[PDB]
Amino acid sequence: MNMLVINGTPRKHGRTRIAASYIAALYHTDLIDLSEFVLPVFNGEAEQSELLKVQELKQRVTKADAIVLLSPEYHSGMSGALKNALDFLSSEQFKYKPVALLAVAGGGKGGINALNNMRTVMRGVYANVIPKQLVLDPVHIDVENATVAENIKESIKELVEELSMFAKAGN
Amino acid sequence: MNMLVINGTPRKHGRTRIAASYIAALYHTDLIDLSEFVLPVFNGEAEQSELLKVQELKQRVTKADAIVLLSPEYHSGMSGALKNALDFLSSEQFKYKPVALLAVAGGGKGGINALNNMRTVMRGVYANVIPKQLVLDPVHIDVENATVAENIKESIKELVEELSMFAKAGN
Ligand SMILES: Cc1cc2nc3c(=O)[nH]c(=O)nc-3n(C[C@H](O)[C@H](O)[C@H](O)COP(=O)(O)O)c2cc1C
Ligand SMILES: Cc1cc2nc3c(=O)[nH]c(=O)nc-3n(C[C@H](O)[C@H](O)[C@H](O)COP(=O)(O)O)c2cc1C
């Protein structure tokens, strides 16, 4: 079970980091934190494909057999940071690969548009997004303790468990 | 009538540039071409808000009284380049401002997801997206002549005309 987790939040001090950091640790996964893994804004130039960064991304993303894609909802969407990232990839690295969506909003009814966005894009690169999805609000993140609240743990378990299921049935 | 046009395509050799470049010229508008206007991937740091670039963006975007937002559909979405841009802004600069969406796909049924994406995000910053929207395929862009095909001109006229209408009724 070679799993990958991508923290779409560019902000190093962002809650999504905490969530992503919790999941990766609890499941011993690869982890691409867009706070550290900084890429340049895509520009189509193939001399950009030869960039330090970029080759590793395709490499790690294609290595994984299942992915947990996290991102904060920014202006009812996924982060520009994560979209830019994805623009470098294609259905080459994602085709038929299991993906679990998870968004980090700021409360209220925020978070679904971030999810539909991701879901649509993922389907754009032909991935296999599992049904169960999840949105984590601030009440689900314990900043002071740099980890997630108890109330949401069971949900994350079920998410990762449905991912694993699909990712296995694959073969 | 102070209008602004934003070419969401990062690629300098991209078709969206041609379209955006045509519209801006035909209507004497401001123009932010994301091929030249390169920003860094957002990161939340306020020391990024003091970046050369960033201050001008908010400035020009808030100056405009109507905006024609163009972008190519990348992985069924708007470009990471343009989303990143928008992440720097907020409902501060967009509230109630008229926006016309226009996407540049590669043919087939591509282009609507790019539009819904933008439409949702725009609504996120409280803008006033006009009803009429438009998708331009390759058959609508005359690359060799660095301009748009005749078949699509009337459509662009109607688009910009509905924008102006709304942008005026505003007051
Ligand atoms: C530019 C910007 C736009 C945002 N837009 C939304 C939004 O549309 N809906 C929402 O629920 N939260 C929004 N947020 C709040 C984030 O979802 C919230 O910060 C969350 O804790 C994720 O934080 P992170 O991006 O630092 O990980 C936005 C935050 C920023 C900085
Ligand atoms: C990473 C990437 C992803 C793309 N995804 C789509 C897509 O989902 N649907 C589509 O109709 N075209 C897609 N295209 C093609 C562009 O829409 C097409 O190039 C168009 O001419 C706009 O070109 P431009 O981005 O250079 O302006 C994609 C192109 C690239 C480079």
Side-chain angles (χ1 to χ4, degrees), chain A residues 79-94:
Chain A
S79 73
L82 166 59
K83 183 54 163 67
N84 199 308
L86 299 162
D87 289 337
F88 283 101
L89 314 188
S90 76
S91 73
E92 169 68 300
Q93 303 93 322
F94 282 113

Side-chain angles (χ1 to χ4, degrees), chain B residues 24 32 45 47 98 102 117 122 128 138 148 168:
Chain B
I32 303 188
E45 322 287 44
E47 62 216 70
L102 190 157
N117 184 196
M122 280 302 113
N128 174 17
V148 308
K168 276 185 180 179

Side-chain angles (χ1 to χ4, degrees), chain A residues 3 15 23 27-29 73-74 82 110 134 139 156-157:
Chain A
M3 202 168 91
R15 295 192 183 72
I23 300 190
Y27 298 78
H28 324 303
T29 67
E73 180 178 89
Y74 286 162
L82 166 59
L134 185 84
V139 62
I156 295 179
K157 194 198 71 188

Side-chain angles (χ1 to χ4, degrees), chain A residues 7-18 71-77 79 103-114 135-138 141, chain B residues 42 44 83 86-90 121 123-125:
Chain A
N7 159 49
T9 193
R11 308 166 57 198
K12 307 186 75 63
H13 55 101
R15 295 192 183 72
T16 318
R17 197 188 189 191
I18 300 185
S71 167
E73 180 178 89
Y74 286 162
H75 301 315
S76 291
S79 73
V104 176
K109 295 290 181 174
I112 303 294
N113 288 310
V135 172
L136 317 202
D137 289 317
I141 300 303
Chain B
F42 176 87
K83 183 54 163 67
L86 299 162
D87 289 337
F88 283 101
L89 314 188
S90 76
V121 173
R123 200 221 70 70
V125 297

Side-chain angles (χ1 to χ4, degrees), chain B residues 9-27:
Chain B
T9 193
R11 308 166 57 198
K12 307 186 75 63
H13 55 101
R15 295 192 183 72
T16 318
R17 197 188 189 191
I18 300 185
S21 189
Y22 162 85
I23 300 190
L26 188 65
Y27 298 78

